[PDB]
Amino acid sequence: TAKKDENFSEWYTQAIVRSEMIEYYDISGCYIMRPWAFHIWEKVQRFFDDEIKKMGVENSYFPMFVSRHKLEKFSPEVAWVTHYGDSPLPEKIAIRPTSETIMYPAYAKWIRSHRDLPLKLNQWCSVVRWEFKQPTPFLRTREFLWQEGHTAHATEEEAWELVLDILELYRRWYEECLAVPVIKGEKSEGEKFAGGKKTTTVEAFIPENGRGIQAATSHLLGTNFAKMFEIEFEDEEGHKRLVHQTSWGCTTRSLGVMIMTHGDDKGLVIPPRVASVQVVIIPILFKDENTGEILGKCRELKTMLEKADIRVRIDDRSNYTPGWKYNHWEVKGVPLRLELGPKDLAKGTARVVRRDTGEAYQISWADLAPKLLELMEGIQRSLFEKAKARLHEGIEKISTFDEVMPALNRKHLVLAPWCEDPESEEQIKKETQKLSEIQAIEAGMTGAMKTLCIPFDQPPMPEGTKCFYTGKPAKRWTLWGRSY
């Protein structure tokens, strides 16, 4: 009903509700994750889990509660448990917004010698961040599922290499699983995690509202938390030294980003590598046909495709028309549908329709498994490459501040030479907010532009390039935009 290029927020709501991905809940900012979305979470979780276990990372489970003393060592976002029944607790306890203060006292106890390092742990769980602003399903919620990984190393260089390895895993999570392009970069001093040394990030872009969104994060913590929690190891000489730490996380926000990137006016489009149903088989069931024969062949084709590890469902319900089923599985984003009626059976072929473009194919039964494998890889790659083209066309390279507001009004990001002085970033935030409010009055949700990241992939910097806002000597190209 709602078109993606008109009212994007109602289009998004419709897409995720009518596909049965989410259900609303009476506590604002929390949503139920129904199986159609949860299956995709399980897929990207299995991918990430397999990859970090190759790195020596092991899973664990730390408590969801943290004592006041351990935590206070943001604060309006922490939900506090204060009573058990109607009786009060001696000291209130907080629900984890993140688990640094829960895990790191244990780390301090576990780590004694250089032979105890590196220590690499992860956990899958939910965290709670209690903001009063308007939530967005998947993207910004008061409770969300995530993983958080936390490691400790004998040297800064080894920790930093792990930070980059994890960030490459997040790039693969988005680009290789979800077909969403991202930009690797480092956060500005004002945007980085306060408790760390350097925050690396992958950033995505939502063309319809022009907003950048942080996709995942990998922090070089250095020795800051090691001094805070007294996490030290002994070298083989016997001298005690602080450990060098990392932490990293990624959330169900990734599902929302995937949904927004690939959806169209008919609803969801799910990349084949994460679709729980890759091929839906729809028999044509005329009253005047050998229905048993048609259903039998559908079952044979399902078996044949599953031997190729294709995930198949047959929708053989007699009480819905094929047109109804076409729309039903399009709305849910199944990437391929296979139609089989008496004429196809007589020709020994099946008709296959791809969800992204609607192109149709007639495929022999012998060619079905390899041709469908090839088509799923083509769909996955085309979804990614068109998203990547939209990303590149959503970024304007600029040289002075005069170009900021026009580009923002085109719902674009800007890539600008920046001197990286923190004071300049907050001046830029405040000025672009003011200019946005003026433009809003002339037109008849926040408008501020901030840094999204300083990209790893730096374009050439001609000698003597000036900062686009301060006029001081520029240091690096920086990606800015309105943001989630």
Next chain:
Amino acid sequence: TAKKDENFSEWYTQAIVRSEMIEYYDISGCYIMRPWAFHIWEKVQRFFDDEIKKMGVENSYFPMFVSRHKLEKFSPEVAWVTHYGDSPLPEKIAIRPTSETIMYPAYAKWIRSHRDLPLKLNQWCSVVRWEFKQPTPFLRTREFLWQEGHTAHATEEEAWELVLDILELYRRWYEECLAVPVIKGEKSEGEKFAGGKKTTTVEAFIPENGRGIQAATSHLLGTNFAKMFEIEFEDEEGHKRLVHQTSWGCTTRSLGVMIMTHGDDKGLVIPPRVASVQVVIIPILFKDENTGEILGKCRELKTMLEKADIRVRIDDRSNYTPGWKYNHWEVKGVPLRLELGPKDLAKGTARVVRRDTGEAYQISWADLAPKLLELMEGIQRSLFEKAKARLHEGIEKISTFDEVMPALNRKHLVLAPWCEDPESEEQIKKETQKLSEIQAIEAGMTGAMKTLCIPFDQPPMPEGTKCFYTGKPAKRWTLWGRSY
């Protein structure tokens, strides 16, 4: 240090701490699950997940918070969130002790027609039950990991068949994965879940303290929650009818039961089917030997065993002796260790020692993979059969109440003919508590005996057998004991 048959509680604490399964935490009743235990949780979770997905059950994720109104529709055990930072919430919200009141309003919305049934959902998450009593790691904790499954059906018979199917999956979880024997049964009217029609259970037994413990649970809810939450469906006639529901759950308590069942004085013994390391390879590293050759052969053997899906770790650390490593991996419960030094290499054999009995074998390299597969299945079966023998010898079949206290003093359960009158069960609880306190004073934690279950496997009931406590006509054999 502590012997299992002397101070069982210190033996248990040592076993789980020195093996690095748990770490203590400053909030009483909560424990950290370290990787050595968490890997076992992941194994039984994968087993259960695979089995219920074959049944059509799909995973999901519902919020951890429930509003006061929805929940109140036990109470001292519910932890309440009342503030965000230092600011109060309009209405307090509770942390899930279980998710019936969170999921079932959604069910009422989702279910409209008989073609929407059955509805089968599960989730893996943690719940919180805030008791002030003394916790026991794994067995009784204020936060614990579990799965909870919740289904809805058009008829009571289909719901009841699902209840039994799930209970058979729990039997397999304990007996087939963990090698722990359990007794299927139905709970008494006084012990069953209040909101349901009938509670089925599998019960285990801890010989060292004589206590039964509920291992997992599967409830026939019938239509009670359907009326509470107005969950109704239409038949093809058009009449509205209440759904018939089930719920079922199982927790990390299962790990504790496994630990207590198979451990010995040296520490943990982990059944091969859930051990994250099934075989540890320990090279002998004399100073005066070709160490590179020995390590190379260890790597080749590891590859050969892993082709047979055996989970292998090589402990090639030069700075620990083989004796130290033997003890280290015994304490952690690895079921098989493989020793390889220059003499073994010259003979083309390896020495293999099984953890349960200490028996040693000399195995040719060609015979290693099939012989180790056979040995792991023998270890698994022997662990189960000896546990099952201890279970059978821990149960005394009795006919009158006079036999209760002697059997309880032998740290046994009793199987007795019972009339199943609820009033009699609470009289029995109170009387055995009083008798236990008297015995405690004569000797120089609760002592009450309650029903554990009415077993599915009923022994013969001679005509006119009387209830062992009331003297009324007996109805069924019932298993009683002290309990967790």
